Protein backbone atom coordinates (compact mmCIF):
# COMPACT_ATOMS: atom_id res chain seq x y z
CA UNK A 1 0.00 0.00 0.00
CA UNK A 2 2.83 2.45 -0.91
CA UNK A 3 1.27 5.88 -1.21
CA UNK A 4 1.74 8.08 -4.31
CA UNK A 5 4.25 10.11 -2.26
CA UNK A 6 6.24 7.09 -1.23
CA UNK A 7 6.30 5.75 -4.83
CA UNK A 8 7.41 9.16 -6.00
CA UNK A 9 10.29 9.07 -3.44
CA UNK A 10 11.20 5.50 -4.42
CA UNK A 11 11.76 6.43 -8.07
CA UNK A 12 15.18 7.96 -7.13
CA UNK A 13 16.55 4.60 -5.96
CA UNK A 14 14.73 2.68 -8.76
CA UNK A 15 16.32 4.91 -11.38
CA UNK A 16 19.87 4.94 -9.86
CA UNK A 17 19.66 1.14 -9.63
CA UNK A 18 18.31 0.80 -13.18
CA UNK A 19 21.13 3.00 -14.46
CA UNK A 20 23.80 1.04 -12.56
CA UNK A 21 22.57 -2.40 -13.76
CA UNK A 22 21.76 -1.33 -17.23
CA UNK A 23 25.22 0.08 -17.54
CA UNK A 24 26.73 -3.16 -16.10
CA UNK A 25 24.61 -5.08 -18.65
CA UNK A 26 25.85 -2.93 -21.49
CA UNK A 27 29.44 -3.47 -20.41
CA UNK A 28 28.69 -7.27 -20.37
CA UNK A 29 27.09 -7.24 -23.81
CA UNK A 30 29.47 -4.77 -25.54
CA UNK A 31 32.77 -5.09 -23.63
CA UNK A 32 35.27 -2.51 -24.89
CA UNK A 33 32.71 -1.16 -27.39
CA UNK A 34 30.41 -0.13 -24.45
CA UNK A 35 30.14 3.71 -24.17
CA UNK A 36 32.10 4.77 -21.06
CA UNK A 37 30.43 6.69 -18.18
CA UNK A 38 32.15 6.27 -14.84
CA UNK A 39 29.35 8.35 -13.25
CA UNK A 40 27.09 5.31 -13.82
CA UNK A 41 29.46 3.07 -11.89
CA UNK A 42 30.06 5.20 -8.79
CA UNK A 43 26.47 6.42 -8.08
CA UNK A 44 24.90 5.55 -4.68
CA UNK A 45 23.47 2.06 -4.60
CA UNK A 46 21.79 -0.32 -2.11
CA UNK A 47 21.70 -3.65 -3.99
CA UNK A 48 19.70 -5.74 -1.57
CA UNK A 49 16.92 -3.21 -0.96
CA UNK A 50 13.53 -3.65 -2.55
CA UNK A 51 13.93 -0.66 -4.85
CA UNK A 52 17.49 -1.87 -5.68
CA UNK A 53 15.95 -5.16 -6.67
CA UNK A 54 13.21 -3.51 -8.66
CA UNK A 55 15.60 -1.35 -10.70
CA UNK A 56 17.71 -4.34 -11.32
CA UNK A 57 14.81 -6.41 -12.64
CA UNK A 58 13.66 -3.45 -14.79
CA UNK A 59 17.22 -3.29 -16.27
CA UNK A 60 17.16 -7.05 -17.05
CA UNK A 61 13.71 -7.15 -18.61
CA UNK A 62 14.32 -3.86 -20.49
CA UNK A 63 17.28 -5.54 -22.21
CA UNK A 64 14.68 -7.52 -24.23
CA UNK A 65 11.59 -5.30 -24.56
CA UNK A 66 13.09 -1.82 -24.70
CA UNK A 67 15.31 -2.67 -27.74
CA UNK A 68 13.34 -0.75 -30.29
CA UNK A 69 12.63 2.38 -28.10
CA UNK A 70 16.37 2.36 -27.34
CA UNK A 71 17.75 2.11 -30.80
CA UNK A 72 15.82 5.21 -31.71
CA UNK A 73 16.64 7.11 -28.50
CA UNK A 74 20.27 6.45 -29.47
CA UNK A 75 19.80 7.91 -32.95
CA UNK A 76 17.49 10.78 -31.92
CA UNK A 77 19.72 12.01 -29.02
CA UNK A 78 22.83 12.25 -31.25
CA UNK A 79 21.66 15.79 -32.09
CA UNK A 80 21.09 17.08 -28.48
CA UNK A 81 23.23 20.05 -27.07
CA UNK A 82 24.90 19.56 -23.59
CA UNK A 83 23.24 22.29 -21.70
CA UNK A 84 20.86 21.78 -18.94
CA UNK A 85 18.19 23.66 -20.83
CA UNK A 86 18.45 21.59 -24.03
CA UNK A 87 18.52 18.46 -21.90
CA UNK A 88 15.38 19.41 -20.06
CA UNK A 89 13.53 20.52 -23.16
CA UNK A 90 14.38 17.30 -24.97
CA UNK A 91 13.59 15.16 -21.91
CA UNK A 92 10.18 16.78 -21.44
CA UNK A 93 9.24 16.44 -25.07
CA UNK A 94 10.08 12.76 -25.35
CA UNK A 95 8.75 11.79 -21.89
CA UNK A 96 5.46 13.66 -22.64
CA UNK A 97 5.19 11.75 -25.96
CA UNK A 98 5.84 8.41 -24.29
CA UNK A 99 2.76 8.87 -22.02
CA UNK A 100 0.38 10.77 -24.31
CA UNK A 101 -1.78 7.62 -24.79
CA UNK A 102 -1.55 6.49 -21.18
CA UNK A 103 0.71 4.59 -18.85
CA UNK A 104 1.93 0.99 -18.89
CA UNK A 105 4.94 -0.79 -17.40
CA UNK A 106 6.72 -1.07 -20.72
CA UNK A 107 6.52 2.75 -21.06
CA UNK A 108 7.79 3.17 -17.52
CA UNK A 109 10.86 1.08 -18.52
CA UNK A 110 11.12 3.14 -21.68
CA UNK A 111 11.25 6.35 -19.72
CA UNK A 112 14.02 4.94 -17.44
CA UNK A 113 15.80 3.83 -20.64
CA UNK A 114 15.47 7.32 -22.13
CA UNK A 115 16.88 8.83 -18.89
CA UNK A 116 19.77 6.38 -19.17
CA UNK A 117 20.47 7.33 -22.82
CA UNK A 118 20.04 11.07 -22.19
CA UNK A 119 22.44 10.94 -19.23
CA UNK A 120 25.02 8.96 -21.22
CA UNK A 121 24.79 11.31 -24.26
CA UNK A 122 25.27 14.48 -22.33
CA UNK A 123 28.17 12.92 -20.42
CA UNK A 124 29.88 11.84 -23.66
CA UNK A 125 29.55 15.40 -25.01
CA UNK A 126 31.24 16.74 -21.88
CA UNK A 127 28.47 17.68 -19.40
CA UNK A 128 29.75 16.07 -16.14
CA UNK A 129 27.86 16.13 -12.84
CA UNK A 130 24.48 15.89 -14.61
CA UNK A 131 23.39 12.32 -13.73
CA UNK A 132 21.68 13.52 -10.59
CA UNK A 133 19.87 16.14 -12.68
CA UNK A 134 18.54 13.53 -15.07
CA UNK A 135 17.44 11.44 -12.05
CA UNK A 136 15.56 14.56 -10.80
CA UNK A 137 14.00 14.98 -14.33
CA UNK A 138 12.68 11.41 -14.02
CA UNK A 139 11.48 11.53 -10.41
CA UNK A 140 9.67 14.80 -10.89
CA UNK A 141 8.12 14.00 -14.24
CA UNK A 142 6.76 10.69 -12.76
CA UNK A 143 5.26 12.53 -9.89
CA UNK A 144 3.64 15.45 -11.75
CA UNK A 145 2.49 13.38 -14.70
CA UNK A 146 0.67 10.91 -12.37
CA UNK A 147 3.02 7.95 -13.13
CA UNK A 148 3.82 7.59 -9.46
CA UNK A 149 0.02 7.56 -8.78
CA UNK A 150 -0.51 4.89 -11.42
CA UNK A 151 2.27 2.71 -9.97
CA UNK A 152 0.90 3.14 -6.49
CA UNK A 153 -2.51 1.94 -7.83
CA UNK A 154 -0.79 -1.22 -9.28
CA UNK A 155 0.69 -2.07 -5.84
CA UNK A 156 3.85 0.13 -5.82
CA UNK A 157 7.25 -0.30 -7.49
CA UNK A 158 7.38 -3.75 -5.86
CA UNK A 159 4.65 -4.82 -8.35
CA UNK A 160 7.43 -4.70 -11.03
CA UNK A 161 9.43 -7.58 -9.53
CA UNK A 162 6.84 -9.93 -11.15
CA UNK A 163 7.48 -8.76 -14.76
CA UNK B 164 -8.40 32.59 -4.77
CA UNK B 165 -5.37 31.23 -6.72
CA UNK B 166 -5.02 27.57 -5.82
CA UNK B 167 -1.73 26.07 -4.55
CA UNK B 168 -1.27 24.60 -8.04
CA UNK B 169 -1.80 27.89 -9.79
CA UNK B 170 0.59 29.69 -7.37
CA UNK B 171 3.13 26.96 -7.97
CA UNK B 172 2.79 27.53 -11.77
CA UNK B 173 3.02 31.30 -11.34
CA UNK B 174 6.40 31.12 -9.62
CA UNK B 175 8.09 30.54 -13.04
CA UNK B 176 7.00 33.95 -14.34
CA UNK B 177 7.54 35.63 -10.92
CA UNK B 178 11.10 34.36 -10.81
CA UNK B 179 11.99 35.16 -14.48
CA UNK B 180 10.57 38.65 -13.92
CA UNK B 181 12.42 39.08 -10.61
CA UNK B 182 15.66 38.02 -12.28
CA UNK B 183 15.16 40.38 -15.23
CA UNK B 184 14.36 43.45 -13.05
CA UNK B 185 16.86 42.69 -10.40
CA UNK B 186 19.50 42.42 -13.05
CA UNK B 187 18.31 45.72 -14.65
CA UNK B 188 18.49 47.28 -11.15
CA UNK B 189 22.01 46.01 -10.62
CA UNK B 190 23.07 47.42 -13.97
CA UNK B 191 21.50 50.78 -12.88
CA UNK B 192 23.22 50.78 -9.50
CA UNK B 193 26.63 49.39 -10.58
CA UNK B 194 26.97 50.39 -14.26
CA UNK B 195 30.12 48.87 -15.75
CA UNK B 196 30.96 47.19 -12.41
CA UNK B 197 27.70 45.13 -12.65
CA UNK B 198 28.46 41.38 -13.16
CA UNK B 199 27.51 40.51 -16.77
CA UNK B 200 24.92 37.79 -17.58
CA UNK B 201 23.23 38.22 -20.93
CA UNK B 202 21.01 35.20 -20.09
CA UNK B 203 19.26 37.49 -17.57
CA UNK B 204 18.49 40.03 -20.27
CA UNK B 205 17.08 37.75 -22.98
CA UNK B 206 14.85 35.44 -20.86
CA UNK B 207 11.09 35.31 -21.66
CA UNK B 208 9.18 38.19 -20.12
CA UNK B 209 5.62 39.59 -20.06
CA UNK B 210 6.02 42.98 -18.34
CA UNK B 211 2.41 44.02 -18.03
CA UNK B 212 1.09 40.73 -16.65
CA UNK B 213 0.24 40.37 -12.99
CA UNK B 214 3.10 37.99 -12.28
CA UNK B 215 5.43 40.29 -14.31
CA UNK B 216 4.33 43.10 -12.04
CA UNK B 217 4.77 41.02 -8.94
CA UNK B 218 8.33 39.97 -9.79
CA UNK B 219 9.14 43.51 -10.59
CA UNK B 220 7.87 44.79 -7.24
CA UNK B 221 9.73 41.97 -5.44
CA UNK B 222 12.95 43.08 -7.25
CA UNK B 223 12.41 46.72 -6.18
CA UNK B 224 11.60 46.02 -2.54
CA UNK B 225 14.35 43.36 -2.30
CA UNK B 226 16.87 46.06 -3.24
CA UNK B 227 16.34 47.47 0.30
CA UNK B 228 15.48 44.51 2.55
CA UNK B 229 17.46 41.67 1.00
CA UNK B 230 20.81 43.56 1.33
CA UNK B 231 22.20 41.53 4.16
CA UNK B 232 21.04 38.05 2.88
CA UNK B 233 22.59 39.06 -0.45
CA UNK B 234 25.96 40.19 0.70
CA UNK B 235 26.45 36.83 2.31
CA UNK B 236 25.03 34.82 -0.61
CA UNK B 237 27.66 36.64 -2.68
CA UNK B 238 30.48 35.63 -0.34
CA UNK B 239 29.21 32.09 0.37
CA UNK B 240 28.63 31.17 -3.34
CA UNK B 241 32.19 32.17 -4.35
CA UNK B 242 33.20 28.60 -3.43
CA UNK B 243 30.49 26.69 -5.45
CA UNK B 244 31.51 24.32 -8.39
CA UNK B 245 29.66 24.77 -11.78
CA UNK B 246 28.07 21.44 -12.10
CA UNK B 247 24.44 20.83 -11.93
CA UNK B 248 24.91 18.53 -8.97
CA UNK B 249 26.90 21.03 -6.87
CA UNK B 250 24.39 23.70 -7.81
CA UNK B 251 21.46 21.62 -6.70
CA UNK B 252 23.09 20.47 -3.50
CA UNK B 253 24.02 24.02 -2.55
CA UNK B 254 20.60 25.38 -3.56
CA UNK B 255 18.76 22.77 -1.48
CA UNK B 256 20.89 23.34 1.57
CA UNK B 257 20.52 27.10 1.63
CA UNK B 258 16.82 27.14 0.61
CA UNK B 259 16.05 24.51 3.33
CA UNK B 260 17.88 26.71 5.89
CA UNK B 261 15.99 29.82 4.82
CA UNK B 262 12.63 28.15 5.68
CA UNK B 263 13.57 25.99 8.67
CA UNK B 264 11.78 28.40 11.07
CA UNK B 265 8.81 29.02 8.80
CA UNK B 266 7.78 31.15 5.87
CA UNK B 267 7.44 34.91 5.48
CA UNK B 268 7.51 37.27 2.49
CA UNK B 269 10.99 38.53 3.26
CA UNK B 270 12.25 34.91 3.08
CA UNK B 271 10.40 34.38 -0.17
CA UNK B 272 12.31 37.40 -1.59
CA UNK B 273 15.48 35.97 -0.10
CA UNK B 274 15.00 32.70 -1.90
CA UNK B 275 14.43 34.52 -5.24
CA UNK B 276 17.57 36.55 -4.43
CA UNK B 277 19.54 33.36 -3.75
CA UNK B 278 18.32 31.89 -7.07
CA UNK B 279 19.47 35.10 -8.76
CA UNK B 280 22.95 34.92 -7.14
CA UNK B 281 23.31 31.17 -7.74
CA UNK B 282 22.39 31.58 -11.42
CA UNK B 283 24.81 34.49 -11.85
CA UNK B 284 27.70 32.64 -10.10
CA UNK B 285 27.42 29.50 -12.13
CA UNK B 286 27.17 31.56 -15.34
CA UNK B 287 30.31 33.55 -14.45
CA UNK B 288 32.19 30.27 -13.86
CA UNK B 289 31.16 29.06 -17.31
CA UNK B 290 27.96 27.00 -16.88
CA UNK B 291 25.72 28.44 -19.67
CA UNK B 292 22.14 27.35 -20.31
CA UNK B 293 21.47 26.84 -16.59
CA UNK B 294 19.13 29.76 -15.79
CA UNK B 295 16.10 27.68 -16.63
CA UNK B 296 17.44 24.98 -14.30
CA UNK B 297 17.73 27.39 -11.41
CA UNK B 298 14.18 28.62 -12.17
CA UNK B 299 13.06 24.93 -11.96
CA UNK B 300 14.99 24.58 -8.61
CA UNK B 301 12.94 27.53 -7.29
CA UNK B 302 9.53 26.55 -8.66
CA UNK B 303 9.82 22.99 -7.44
CA UNK B 304 11.26 23.77 -4.04
CA UNK B 305 8.38 26.29 -3.45
CA UNK B 306 5.86 23.69 -4.37
CA UNK B 307 7.21 20.73 -2.37
CA UNK B 308 8.20 22.76 0.65
CA UNK B 309 4.65 24.23 0.93
CA UNK B 310 5.71 27.83 0.03
CA UNK B 311 3.26 27.88 -2.83
CA UNK B 312 0.55 26.70 -0.35
CA UNK B 313 1.48 29.44 2.09
CA UNK B 314 1.33 32.11 -0.63
CA UNK B 315 -2.00 30.81 -1.83
CA UNK B 316 -3.28 31.13 1.79
CA UNK B 317 -2.11 34.83 1.83
CA UNK B 318 -4.15 35.58 -1.34
CA UNK B 319 -1.70 34.42 -4.08
CA UNK B 320 1.39 36.07 -5.57
CA UNK B 321 -0.79 39.13 -6.20
CA UNK B 322 -0.76 39.70 -2.40
CA UNK B 323 2.92 40.78 -2.85
CA UNK B 324 2.07 43.88 -4.91
CA UNK B 325 1.14 45.57 -1.58
CA UNK B 326 4.61 45.17 0.03
Ligand SMILES: [Zn+2]
Pocket residue numbers: 140143144303306307
Ligand atom coordinates in the same frame (compact mmCIF):
# COMPACT_ATOMS: atom_id res chain seq x y z
ZN1 LIG C 1 7.96 18.63 -8.41
